[PDB]
Amino acid sequence: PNIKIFSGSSHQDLSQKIADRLGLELGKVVTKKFSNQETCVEIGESVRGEDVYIVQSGCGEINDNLMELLIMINACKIASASRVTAVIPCFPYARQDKKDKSRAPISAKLVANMLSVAGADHIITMDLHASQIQGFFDIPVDNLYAEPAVLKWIRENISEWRNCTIVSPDAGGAKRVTSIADRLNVDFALIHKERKKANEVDRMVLVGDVKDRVAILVDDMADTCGTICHAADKLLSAGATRVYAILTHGIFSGPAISRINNACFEAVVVTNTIPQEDKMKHCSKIQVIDISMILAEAIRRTHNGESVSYLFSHVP
Amino acid sequence: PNIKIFSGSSHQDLSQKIADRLGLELGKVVTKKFSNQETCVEIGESVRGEDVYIVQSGCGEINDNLMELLIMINACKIASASRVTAVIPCFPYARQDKKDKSRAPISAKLVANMLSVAGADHIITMDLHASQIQGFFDIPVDNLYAEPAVLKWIRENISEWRNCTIVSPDAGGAKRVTSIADRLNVDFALIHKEDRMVLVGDVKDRVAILVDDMADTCGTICHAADKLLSAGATRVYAILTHGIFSGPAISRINNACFEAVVVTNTIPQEDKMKHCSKIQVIDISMILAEAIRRTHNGESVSYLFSHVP
Amino acid sequence: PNIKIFSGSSHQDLSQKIADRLGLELGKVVTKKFSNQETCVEIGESVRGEDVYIVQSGCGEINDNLMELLIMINACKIASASRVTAVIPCFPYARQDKKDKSRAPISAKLVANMLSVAGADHIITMDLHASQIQGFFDIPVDNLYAEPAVLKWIRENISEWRNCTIVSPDAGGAKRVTSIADRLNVDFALIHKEDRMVLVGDVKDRVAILVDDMADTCGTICHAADKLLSAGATRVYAILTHGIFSGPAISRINNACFEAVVVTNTIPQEDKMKHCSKIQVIDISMILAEAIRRTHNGESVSYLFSHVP
Amino acid sequence: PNIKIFSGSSHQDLSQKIADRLGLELGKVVTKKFSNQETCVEIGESVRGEDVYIVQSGCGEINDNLMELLIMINACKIASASRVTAVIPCFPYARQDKKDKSRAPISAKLVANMLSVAGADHIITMDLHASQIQGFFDIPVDNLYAEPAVLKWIRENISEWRNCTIVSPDAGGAKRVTSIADRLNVDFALIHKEDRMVLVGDVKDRVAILVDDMADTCGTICHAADKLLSAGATRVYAILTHGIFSGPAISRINNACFEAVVVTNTIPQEDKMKHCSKIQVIDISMILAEAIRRTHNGESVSYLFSHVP
Amino acid sequence: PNIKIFSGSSHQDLSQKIADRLGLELGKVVTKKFSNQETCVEIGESVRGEDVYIVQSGCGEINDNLMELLIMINACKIASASRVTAVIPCFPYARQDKKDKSRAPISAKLVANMLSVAGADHIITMDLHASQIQGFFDIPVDNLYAEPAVLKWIRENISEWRNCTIVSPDAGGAKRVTSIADRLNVDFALIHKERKKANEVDRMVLVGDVKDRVAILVDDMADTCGTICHAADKLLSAGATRVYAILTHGIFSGPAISRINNACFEAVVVTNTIPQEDKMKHCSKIQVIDISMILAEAIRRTHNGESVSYLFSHVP
Amino acid sequence: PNIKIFSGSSHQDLSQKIADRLGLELGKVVTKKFSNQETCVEIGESVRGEDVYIVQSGCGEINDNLMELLIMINACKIASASRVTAVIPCFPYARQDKKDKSRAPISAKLVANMLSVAGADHIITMDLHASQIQGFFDIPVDNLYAEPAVLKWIRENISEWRNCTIVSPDAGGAKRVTSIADRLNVDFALIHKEDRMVLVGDVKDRVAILVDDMADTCGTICHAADKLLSAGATRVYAILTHGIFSGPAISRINNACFEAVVVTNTIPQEDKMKHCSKIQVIDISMILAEAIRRTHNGESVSYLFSHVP
Ligand SMILES: Nc1ncnc2c1ncn2[C@@H]1O[C@H](COP(=O)(O)OP(=O)(O)OP(=O)(O)O)[C@@H](O)[C@H]1O
Ligand SMILES: Nc1ncnc2c1ncn2[C@@H]1O[C@H](COP(=O)(O)OP(=O)(O)OP(=O)(O)O)[C@@H](O)[C@H]1O
Ligand SMILES: Nc1ncnc2c1ncn2[C@@H]1O[C@H](COP(=O)(O)OP(=O)(O)OP(=O)(O)O)[C@@H](O)[C@H]1O
Ligand SMILES: Nc1ncnc2c1ncn2[C@@H]1O[C@H](COP(=O)(O)OP(=O)(O)OP(=O)(O)O)[C@@H](O)[C@H]1O
Ligand SMILES: O=P(O)(O)OC[C@H]1O[C@H](OP(=O)(O)OP(=O)(O)O)[C@H](O)[C@@H]1O
């Protein structure tokens, strides 16, 4: 089997970058809409006995993109592909990974079931919101990390990075930021939101020295940017010289762009798991780390039977 | 177990009509979108041990509505509903029921698989594009027919129906028109394209009634009506269960010679009816309500294939 | 993995022809019956790690042959074959592909489920009665077409084929005849019953060619031929991929006006050919052999949809 | 849900007896063959929400009867029966329950898989050849025993039963004969072949009773009876739950020294009884009827393992 | 169908308490071991058409108890029970709910799969280590919370409860403690915990004020008690007046009893999801909250089709 | 894909012997227990795209070892191994292969289901207690036989083997002893209990060889040996593939008249051999290594049923 790379309509630039890194052309596929807005898919070349990788991120018109991905997987599977891999850089419905005390769906599990029933044999994703989502599948899931790229960006783009502090915005971010700070051998600070009972103003609690220093918030995603904006205001109050935010998933929905433009961030850095050009047009402080080399290496290593976890710590 | 009816966002008015016919209130459910446009579903009441029916048609923003339906089914299933039934008046992706020479998905089969894995124990639908779609499922599927309501409309609205002709627009669905003509005891004239059309069956000085399962772009019925008017039919009617009316459909209907374009309300029609005066709607909420009630009570559903409740 | 071809008992000659075209011997298998008429299957050679193809058509004693096929698939699967493919030239129970108003099984879906649970990873078949049957499976299904061989036969056997007409016997399968007429660049005359038949398309002083997927009792083609001869066609031919010819079929063909009834050899025809002089057979073993070879080698199978190998 | 009993074509008289014992009429079903010998099934009454029992034994044309059973199960399942139970008095392919050194199917497992995928929720059977077959299913399987009826027959028909001997024909099934001898408080003499046979247990001047699960060709019981008569047994009886009697069985029984060959009516016996005077039948319809009634009512089925109803 | 409660060998006292609250006798079942130490199970009464509840906790000889539960489920399923429910107060292998950056199993997913294939139709458990484990199943899972009983105990046992801090010892507990701090209307604090090796705690960071106030560490389980002992040390160093520890699952393996006896806790409160009598014989400061009423009510409400989530906020 | 052999904790020496015969090192794996006694598994090397074999026998702390095996299979499966094979020399819960009259689990079927859901694509085992267990799986199962190694041991260790007798201890497994006697061309004397035992077959002044699949408490072989010594056998041997030897087994063997109790090393025997001088071990690591090598290379495994490698 040879590698065949197909792009969904969600992130064509990323698929092209990945295909270029692998020395391949993107596979021929028509992905459009019928008049009544049903997804139309037509695989334009034989995939019989091939190793097929479909690249589609959970962004934009999320339900349209997810349906398109499922339909493409099904089309490849009944076209007798030897193996079908969903390359989903930003996993959709990842934040609905549990019920809690609510009569709610576990939408991430439903997405996993849908991907499996469509025919996917392998999932490659980046920085799952909760790595327990790996257990929502029976097929193997390769959960890559943007951390090596993040460390590279910090070391090349921040002059005081040896004296910076890596800040977690919420309680759930402390593990990622501690891993980053351990790799950088720098201090870290932790932030979380206090109880919604001091009705005068919502209060952030910060532990760890940041005064007269460069502070770097790190998180998995910024959707409405409430989290990072609150954390950045807290950090500015505590005397940090400059504030950066680094995120793998730049969703930037709702008021995110206005909030960022009005915030004190020196830079908001995201990976390109989601297309960012349109958002960068409206926000001068968004910078993008390319992760297409990580994805290309993951695809190539899965195809060749090489170790993918080598990419957890080594920039290709 | 009691009946609980939940509405998706696609067709709220139909769900309300069904609930009124059953003497029930619609179940409390929040169906909206998160900021990033992911579907958010919250079941506002316990469904534990209940017989849940979720009403969602394959119309409008079809992918959003299908995702919403699947998410609602999943929420009800993991909330320990005794049984979950998807009431899908217009089945999405029904026209992608085969490959036939192309490297294409069988999207209808994928939709059936997704409904099954979401947890649906039962499907109720109306006038499937291909009844072979029933075989795409391993759970029972009740495929209702609009034909009794169509026959009622014909008898109460077309004064010359005893002399009329029932015309299939494409050769594929002529089975429907033969059944209707047999019920009415009339001739079934047939039409198919060769940019020219060929028609068998005397239509001169008569009323012709086109019958089909759906009108999407109305290319099919407008061409057939042009042919029929070429052959001297006094009036031409079109009757369809699913009024999708996407793309240029409203303009084509406005510029066509139809006396009336009758559709069922498996799909909401008010917006289309605003822009097109010749669209009339047959309410099929009684048929769906009766199907729900009969499946719940263990009564015969196939009795509805020939009886207006 | 190497190709291993095994024959069921239904169509030994076809399996041998396929094996010769592939340069292979048929795999050693004992397929017989115990005293109480239960199927006995014994794989006479290791299939461990091999690409196994089992050839069995849905003909003759259909239930025995289907059971034999399932038992052979199971034996090969638990003997650690790398892949098992059912080569089913005529798919059994294909005409029971829907319910449509009756409390009936969807037997084709049941057969698909049984083939899947027996362990088939892949299906190769020819001219499925309804291509929606491909959606009854979750494994890939390659539905081959007899059309290239049919076109070759028409060009080499009917001197007036450029002026002929391609006639569908029932409205359902007119898609096949339109494809054939487009390939030949001729008119497609159509026929359907109203005990009377209606025909569109000039057939006078011409050759008419009936094309259909199968002839079981030949009621369908004999009625169509009677109609065509009413309208002055000089000769009438019937061409079918599946020559089932059950019941009164041979007598009806003998008493009908067909110049020729051409069938493929998806079903053995020698016994029927003994009693009917106008039956001719098109060998499709090259198409099946090429499909097997291309699936094994990862080559395009759809290339066969338009090319005679 | 109410009990609905449907009969396959294999054993109509047994199904009628079961239905009479339950105070029910047999459900309306058309079970016939199309012209090309494909099974045709039509459920003549709604089974929606009902507890359906389909009675079909693995006898006669076994592959046809098995296909018919699977098709009936599928029809009832997609007709929204609340539960479908296959009542299979003689389980087909039960003797192919293992491979053991040969490249052979495990046909019993395939049959179990097919019954499961057809939609059976429950299996009722009698004296499975190997009770490990219960583990071939993931659904519950109630394996009934003919032993209470056999003990009743022995006590009411053999005057010297207190002095008799219960003999296993092959070493495999001696468990059955030990259970029977323990119930009767008698000795269990054993027999196995080395073309010569070896017997342990005093049989001289006594009655010997061969007990086995089935007699197919009667090679097993005729050899055992020859041995027993060599050792001076005054009379020899054979008792079996399944009287298959295929091949040369009737002639061998006629030429053997059996005082009686008693079988249950898990398989119809009238035709065999016409040609063999020493065959007698034990009715087990009460046991099957009680099992059906107890599974329906949630009552203990295992109570039947030791009690004649 | 009637309720039939069967007990496994793990927590017989809990099963008896549950049966008493339901006005039922425990079902007749033999659960022992063959000579070669395979599990032997024999159901001593017909379960045909019944609603069967099997109570087995993930404690003691965990693999033995898990196999016994699976075998009991299988026996009941093939004895034609109308419904089989696994009542698992402490879910075994819950802490192996993800891979992270390791070639490790997701053992919790495996256990969910084995429960499903054995024939379980429904799971009742309490305070799952990660509620994403609910998504590991396709059958419904009722995850009950000890929180109502915990609130009862706090209000009836700590005099200064209106002026206390609720402290999470790791991030996984944060939601829990915040909920509790909401109900009591008090302050919370979060401790970020880093482990390098299994069963050992490496570093801790306290975020949130605890000075001059009673501290209530709240967590889901105490296995080796390294987490709560390190957390109590951190709280005292930060100036907590006194430290209580409240957990639902009292595993108390390894050095746990020794560490607790040498620690500074006013009390270590656990529920009886795991049997505690032996541990209490050697450790004076362990108190037990009975949760058998919650479990019995959940069983009764699932049987009767009543609301189970009503128990998330209401002690019966 | 390359062969990777991983050892569970049950039988490390056997796994090492297998790995040496294949010219491989054991794969790096950490298999230990957390503080609360939950199994901890860590695969120390990439298995992506490799053919993984996990060696674990159903012995010792059986539930711990079975859990460890399932957890290892799961870890290898989600680490993208191309294929995972469980090499289980002694299959756990094999004796619970049926219910038979009791409200009991079929634990062997549960174990098969658990192995399948954990992700095993293939099972290799030796002398299953009941070969019907192969039908408990849907994946291929290669059931190897110790018989070639047993025959080799008999020929090289019993000087009078041409005159010896092969004795089955229970009627159930006499098939094994008939196969062995046929291979050796000797008589197969049989034994079964009625607290008394009955024996057929001249054993006087001869060597008797008891052959069975396993010895757990040795109640079965000690009773049989007592019977044989009653009938004048000069020496009595016991040969078993699985030497479980639980409970009072070692004391019974020490107090019995066995010349030798020979077992294979499907279960570690050193500890038992310390306390019992008459236990001897046949190494079957060559058979398991050859089976692994042949499954990997697509070579015939059944060739090992009759050939010592
Ligand atoms: N939502 C859609 N809108 C428009 N075309 C669609 C849609 N879904 C599928 N199609 C395409 O429409 C075609 C199916 O057309 P249609 O159902 O009218 O005819 P058919 O299936 O060929 O024959 P018939 O229904 O007459 O037996 C296919 O090419 C299919 O890909
Ligand atoms: N083997 C068989 N022989 C004869 N009739 C059969 C067989 N199997 C099914 N049938 C019946 O034949 C009918 C199907 O007929 P047919 O396929 O010719 O037409 P259709 O499916 O209604 O329409 P079309 O194929 O023209 O779209 C059904 O009533 C079905 O029950
Ligand atoms: N319908 C059948 N008629 C005859 N023989 C059959 C049938 N089905 C399977 N067999 C064969 O019969 C043999 C099984 O024989 P049988 O059940 O009498 O003995 P066994 O399984 O070896 O041992 P036992 O039942 O005494 O423990 C196998 O070789 C099997 O292939
Ligand atoms: N690990 C075990 N140790 C001891 N007894 C067990 C074990 N597992 C199951 N059993 C019991 O042992 C019995 C099975 O015994 P055994 O396999 O010796 O004879 P059988 O299956 O009745 O007949 P045979 O094997 O001779 O055909 C059953 O009652 C079963 O519950
Ligand atoms: O063995 P002990 O020292 O008593 O520790 C037991 C801890 O293990 C779990 O924490 P985990 O490390 O899984 O972190 P999490 O709760 O944040 O997932 C659990 O939350 C307990 O705090």
Ligand SMILES: O=P(O)(O)OC[C@H]1O[C@H](O)[C@H](O)[C@@H]1O
């Ligand atoms: O609230 P938003 O800023 O829109 O979303 C970003 C954060 O919210 C979620 O918890 C994510 O994991 C991030 O931590």
Ligand SMILES: O=P(O)(O)OC[C@H]1O[C@H](O)[C@H](O)[C@@H]1O
């Ligand atoms: O009873 P034990 O001696 O412990 O177990 C050994 C025998 O018991 C079982 O039937 C085995 O197959 C052996 O024949």
Ligand SMILES: [Mg+2]
């Ligand atoms: Mg977060």
Ligand SMILES: [Mg+2]
């Ligand atoms: Mg149409």
Ligand SMILES: [Mg+2]
């Ligand atoms: Mg036709």
Ligand SMILES: [Mg+2]
């Ligand atoms: Mg026998």
Ligand SMILES: [Mg+2]
């Ligand atoms: Mg924790």
Ligand SMILES: [Mg+2]
């Ligand atoms: Mg034995």
